[PDB]
Amino acid sequence: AAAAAAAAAAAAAAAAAAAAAAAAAAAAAAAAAAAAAAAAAAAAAAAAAAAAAAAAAAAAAAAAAAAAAAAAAAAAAAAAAAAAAAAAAAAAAAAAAAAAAAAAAAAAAAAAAAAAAAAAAAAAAAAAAAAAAA
RNA sequence: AGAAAAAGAAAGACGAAGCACUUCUUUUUCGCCAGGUUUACUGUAAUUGUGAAAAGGUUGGAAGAUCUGGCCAAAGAAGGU
């Protein structure tokens, strides 16, 4: 950060967050806000990704839903990808059991991509059927 | 694979500026097949038909011969009168 490293500093922040920086139900958002400006919308998406990893505040399901809604609204590739993926992982808002055919298929029909990111994660944890059709 | 993050892109209806501001809701990226859905028609093989050039006197059956003298040649390859 004294090397003014927007990039390398957000890098180290994701690094330590994965390397077990505290979560503490507040340390999550603490490190995330610390990383959020970092001259990079991608850096804020990386903060949100390390956040979804450290599931302290990530258990706010509709909150991850709204954050990723604004993200995939603004067309943030890294944000939509990491957020929605680890969201479906921590059972946050990416699908359902009665509106999953809408939710997941709409994350794909968002735009032309995050379809391949579903193939990265979300299609893997599809769970949009217990069948073979979907 | 070992565990040692990853790396991506379309239109339509809705508010708005009479479009774009993006926010919700569906849309497709050929292994090799096969008609077709009209082509912006224009530069880039060729066939066949066309494809130029003045007159006079002489002998002879008849001139292309002859004497006098002009014209074409990217045609003086040839073939008949």
For residue A89, say whether its CB is under 7 Å from any atom of strand B: no
For residue A38, say whether its CB is under 7 Å from any atom of strand B: no
Distance of CA A46 to the CA centre of its chain: 8
Reported structure resolution in angstroms: 3.9
Which structural technique was applied? cryo-EM
Burial class for A123, CB neighbours closer than 10 Å (0-12, 13-18, 19+) = middle
Question: Straight-line distance from CA A25 to C1' B52, in Å?
Answer: 107
Judge whether A92 and A61 are in contact, CB under 8 Å: yes
For residue A55, say whether its CB is under 7 Å from any atom of strand B: no
Q: Distance (Å, rounded) from C-alpha A49 to C-alpha A80? A: 10
Q: Distance (Å, rounded) from C-alpha A117 to C-alpha A85? A: 8
Phi-psi domain of A22 (left: phi exceeds 0; alpha: psi -120 through 50; beta: other) = beta
Q: Distance (Å, rounded) from C-alpha A52 to C-alpha A84? A: 9
Nucleotides of B under 7 A from a protein CB: 5-11, 22-29
Give the pair of three-digit tokens for residue A33.
């806000």
